Ligand binder design. Structure first.
Ligand code: NAD
Ligand code: NAD
Lengths: 315, 315
């Protein structure tokens, strides 16, 4: 199968590229390298089944060229930084809504049969039902990022129905592991490398969120994709997260422990009731019953995934 | 209170303007007259409480000008309802996502405290539960128009939470009445005026939809708005439709009757199972229990609304 991975030079994208290349897919990566790096995929350069295109998906000609002769698109290009929402909403809109719109216009009449989209738990906002099922509603995102992800899902559904392709929408929890350059673990490790004596923690440390290691995440994406390929649904919605959750404070403790440091935790007290920033969801735990029906399950719980990520990042 | 009505020269917007002006609001209209008309609101020019701005919401400067010194925005500007099947994805994206995005960016730098948005039943797609409640999910719109409306809702919710204003999202069923130049009744009347002997009906005539007369619709918008003003919800979702529904064939019969005509009905059979066009939902009936708890209820059922609309249009 011929596949396009947008954002394939990024964190999740490069691990996905690795898996697809190792299973004999013909893989084209489209990435503007605004956050990704060729280093994440450099072992594949020159491989006859691999092609890399450096291009900004704001440019419709580049997107139309990248979808040509492709059977499936894994659309992982985005700016995933929730924190920047109250300073740079334009960036989040452009890199989540606008470029997905461009992709969808390119996909129309292109012979692409499948579109896999990495959405986010943030589409649920402060979800009132926990663990949160895929049919939870009203969907009320509280960040510009979660709103942009939800808007992208909507456009995908409408285009899939109108121009006859199939869409797999995967709402990810927090994904951590090697090659990650955003999120709380990354922030904590680099802060403690700069100053081992103190740790600036945004918010009050009580935010509880489900974490998945990249290995379980890629396994789950492939399991869902293969199940989807064999199914009949035009648009399919799946949560992908862990069975449990962990607090920001516990993450700081694990990071400190693995670095053999004992810093003073400096909690900023946050906003809107201890959130780290405007739009930061306080409680997140996705139901994964639907994903588990495919046979997938995480091998590591949230605490193990955090500890493994820290160890990997310090080596 | 000072309010801005985008699309205020259109069908619903001009009736809303009438009501707000009669209740002593200071009203500003923003409309590019792409589908609306000066005739719908010209009677208010010269009133010291009324201002008209002819401007395209693709223009960020005019939107920024229009939100100045405004307390509430009623955002009714959108793609026209006339033949939505034949409208291109680019037009739908620009007139639903793009101009809403421009509005939200203007609002974050203003004194706007409330944003009311007329969304559409089409965000529900082919809902499996009928009457369809506000918490129906997964939302899987089947047209680019329904997807674009859902994208606008998402952006509104995220901006509301991030930039501290309150949003009232009202999902409208089919709205009919005087000044409407869209939809099946208007098309049927003009077709029978051109040729009284035959009526070409798109689709199979069995599409069943909830119709609300404009008078009930404005009553409901105001009831929900006043209730929302007295509440604390940051973002609130309401359906606004009728208790019942009616088929295209029945509407054609009513139109013929009120015109004293007896034409031959020629059903084209449509597409995708008798739909009038690609992406036309076959069955639509919104649950209005939530709205009815505010004390609102439709005075006219779908049949009465159709009959009154026909009489008004023939005047
Ligand atoms: N990492 C997480 O915890 C997480 C959680 C939920 C969802 N997601 C989603 O998963 C996907 C991957 O995220 P990630 O964490 O690997 O982020 P990342 O930033 O590492 O990867 C995203 C890639 O997109 C590329 N990109 C950005 N804008 C682009 C543009 N205009 N044109 C082309 N390429 C562009 C970047 O260069 C980057 O390589 C995204 O859709 C993200 O929203 C991630
Ligand atoms: N009429 C219905 O049955 C129905 C059903 C569901 C939702 N709605 C929604 O209700 C709202 C009003 O619909 P309506 O039936 O009154 O439609 P309408 O076309 O009569 O009113 C929309 C108005 O917006 C204006 N407009 C469009 N694009 C603009 C732009 N870029 N800048 C400025 N003005 C612009 C048009 O000139 C028009 O006056 C819309 O949001 C529509 O999607 C209507």
């Amino acid at each position: 199968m011929r596949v396009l991975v947008t954002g394939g030079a990024g964190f999740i994208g490069s691990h996905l590229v690795d898996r697809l290349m190792e299973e004999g897919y013909k893989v084209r990566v489209l990435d503007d390298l605004s956050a990704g790096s060729l280093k994440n995929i450099e072992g594949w350069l020159g491989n006859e089944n691999f092609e890399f295109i450096k291009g900004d998906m704001r440019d419709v000609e580049i997107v139309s060229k990248a979808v040509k002769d492709v059977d499936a698109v894994f659309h992982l290009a985005a700016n995933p930084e929730v924190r920047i929402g109250s300073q740079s909403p334009e960036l989040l809109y452009e890199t989540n809504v606008l470029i997905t719109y461009n992709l969808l216009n390119a996909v129309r009449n292109s012979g692409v049969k499948y579109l896999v989209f990495t959405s986010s738990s943030t589409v649920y906002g402060d979800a009132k039902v926990i663990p949160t099922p895929e049919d939870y509603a009203p969907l009320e995102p509280i960040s510009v990022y979660g709103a942009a992800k939800l808007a992208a899902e909507a456009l995908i559904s409408g285009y899939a129905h109108t121009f006859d392709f199939r869409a797999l929408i995967i709402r990810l929890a927090n994904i951590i592991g090697k090659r990650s350059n955003h999120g709380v673990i990354y922030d904590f490790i680099n802060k403690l490398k700069a100053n081992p004596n103190e740790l600036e923690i945004l918010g009050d440390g009580t935010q509880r969120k489900s974490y998945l290691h990249i290995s379980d995440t890629i396994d789950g994406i492939m399991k869902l994709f293969e199940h989807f390929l064999n199914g009949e649904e035009r648009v399919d919605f799946y949560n992908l997260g862990n069975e449990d959750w962990i607090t920001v404070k516990e993450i700081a403790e694990i990071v400190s422990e693995e670095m053999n440091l004992n810093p003073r935790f400096k909690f900023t007290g946050g906003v809107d009731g201890g959130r780290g920033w405007k739009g930061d969801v306080k409680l997140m735990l996705l139901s994964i019953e639907k994903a588990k029906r495919t046979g997938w399950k995480p091998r590591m719980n949230s605490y193990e995934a955090v500890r493994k990520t820290v160890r990997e990042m310090l080596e």
